[PDB]
Amino acid sequence: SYNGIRIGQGYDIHKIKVLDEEKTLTLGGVKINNVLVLSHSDGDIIYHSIVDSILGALGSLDIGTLFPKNSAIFLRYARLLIYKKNYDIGNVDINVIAQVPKISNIRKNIIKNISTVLNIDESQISVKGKTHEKLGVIGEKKAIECFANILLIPKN
Amino acid sequence: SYNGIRIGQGYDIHKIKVLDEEKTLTLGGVKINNVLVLSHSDGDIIYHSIVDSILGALGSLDIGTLFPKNSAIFLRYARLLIYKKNYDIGNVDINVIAQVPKISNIRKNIIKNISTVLNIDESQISVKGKTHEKLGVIGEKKAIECFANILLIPKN
Amino acid sequence: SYNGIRIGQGYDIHKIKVLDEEKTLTLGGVKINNVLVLSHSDGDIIYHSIVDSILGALGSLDIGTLFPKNSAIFLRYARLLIYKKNYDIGNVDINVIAQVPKISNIRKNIIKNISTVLNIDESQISVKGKTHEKLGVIGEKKAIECFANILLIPKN
Ligand SMILES: Nc1ccn([C@@H]2O[C@H](COP(=O)(O)OP(=O)(O)O)[C@@H](O)[C@H]2O)c(=O)n1
Ligand SMILES: Nc1ccn([C@@H]2O[C@H](COP(=O)(O)OP(=O)(O)O)[C@@H](O)[C@H]2O)c(=O)n1
Ligand SMILES: Nc1ccn([C@@H]2O[C@H](COP(=O)(O)OP(=O)(O)O)[C@@H](O)[C@H]2O)c(=O)n1
Ligand SMILES: [Cl-]
Ligand SMILES: [Cl-]
Ligand SMILES: [Cl-]
Ligand SMILES: [Cl-]
Ligand SMILES: [Cl-]
Ligand SMILES: [Cl-]
Ligand SMILES: [Cl-]
Ligand SMILES: [Cl-]
Ligand SMILES: [Cl-]
Ligand SMILES: [Zn+2]
Ligand SMILES: [Zn+2]
Ligand SMILES: [Zn+2]
Ligand SMILES: [Zn+2]
Ligand SMILES: [Zn+2]
Ligand SMILES: [Zn+2]
């Protein structure tokens, strides 16, 4: 099998409801108290997209296929999968597309959370947010989405 | 010129019509009998995005520019282009965004088809599907889209 | 800190108005005389996404966070950031999603501009355009978007 450098991209989207004037969202392990997420899961697009980026990189079946609370269970599986396949994470770059919340205000916390759950250094993690210019389903605050991009580097 | 590791990302989108109650789509070389694709081409977002990921990685002009049935012709061009530029494929990770069909039900076939047409091992290929939460043009089954991410590794 | 190969992905979107029958857009440093961009910035999704791909790859704060004309200022920052962190650019692959303008007609100019501002060879750059099948906000010419994908390679 292929044991060289591997690229992965994870994608996720969840429906949200912003608590304006007319379950609580979790994002990179950080509770977002002014936004509700309409999902059976915790709605954490960052954690979910990171997991699928890792699975994708290794050619494993995705979380939905493998397993038809949970975000922590999936992140620990992914961490241990990387280890048992003799890989290290190089870096991860995460793009959140969302009107709200403001990722730059919670970046440090998200990066700390990701570093802890994956057992990597904060210097290996990037998380950035961009609005959708108030256009389309994301722009009208009906949903938020995440693209997670990762490199896995073979050990020795 | 640059002869080091290369990253590529391919994107494609095609209009579809799901055969519900009020040309046949091909996806990763697999016929999808309950979905029509409204395109001049075969509508195979997976094969097309894979080709453009390879061209993109190598800095070549895209399929639309190079060549203004066909999917097989383009995939063989891409395979031979990688070879003549002294590269091997590392791995490819493919993200389909679509309400239907269910990629996990046809994953094995798609992966087998990609491995055959690119002459690589199945362990170098990932294909995953995600819905769009029934929101927007993808969510309303008006279209399907694909992001293909690839690494090309120099030979010796 | 991590000093190995790094992946980055930049995303950007800007609102546009096509000058049909019932500020001027800049794209990869090329003026697009038949399209207006509705932004406080120059609206250059290519340059902006390239910058954020570089920042993302290195784990730096994004342009919006770092700096709350300008596109040239940000591209020179990114170039010098790569240098001071002891990295070289491997290659960059850029995907523009837009009905208009036609990227293939201005590809050579964009690639020349990117090579000049980043001080890299044209063989390290790919830029490709795809329509959105006249569907959604992009398809209805309300916006254009860019995904920039990059590898940074450590020096020696
Ligand atoms: N076109 C599709 C859609 C979903 N699926 C599978 O269904 C699972 C869940 O789909 P979903 O879009 O509802 O995602 P979640 O709501 O679980 O986050 C995915 O992880 C895939 O395994 C697929 O294989 N192909
Ligand atoms: N903004 C755009 C749109 C299309 N194009 C070119 O037109 C070709 C076909 O465009 P399209 O969006 O109709 O894609 P297909 O329907 O051929 O899959 C692309 O491959 C590009 O070469 C471009 O260069 N810039
Ligand atoms: N969900 C979001 C949205 C914006 N932002 C920040 O706000 C800056 C500008 O956001 P924007 O979507 O208006 O992008 P521009 O119009 O500046 O191109 C971004 O670069 C981020 O630093 C964020 O951190 N999280
Ligand atoms: Cl949801
Ligand atoms: Cl988008
Ligand atoms: Cl969207
Ligand atoms: Cl189509
Ligand atoms: Cl999307
Ligand atoms: Cl879309
Ligand atoms: Cl804008
Ligand atoms: Cl899109
Ligand atoms: Cl969009
Ligand atoms: Zn999710
Ligand atoms: Zn968009
Ligand atoms: Zn196509
Ligand atoms: Zn979306
Ligand atoms: Zn911008
Ligand atoms: Zn789309």
Residue numbers in the entry:
A (entry chain A), B (entry chain A), C (entry chain A): 60 to 81, 98 to 143, 152 to 239
Cite, word for word, the article reporting this structure.
2C-methyl-D-erythritol-2,4-cyclodiphosphate synthase (IspF) catalyzes the conversion of 4-diphosphocytidyl-2C-methyl-D-erythritol-2-phosphate to 2C-methyl-D-erythritol-2,4-cyclodiphosphate and cytidine monophosphate in production of isoprenoid-precursors via the methylerythritol phosphate biosynthetic pathway.
Here, residues Tyr82 - Phe97 could not be modeled due to the lack of ordered electron density. The coordinating residues are Asp10, His12 and His44 in BcIspF, Asp71, His73 and His123 in PfIspF. Similarly in PfIspF side chains of Tyr70, Ile72, Ile180 and Val220 line this cavity, and the side chains of Phe230 form the floor of the cavity. In PfIspF, a sulfate binds close to this site but dislodged such that anion coordination involves the main chain amides of nearby residues, Val220 from all three subunits, rather than a basic side chain.
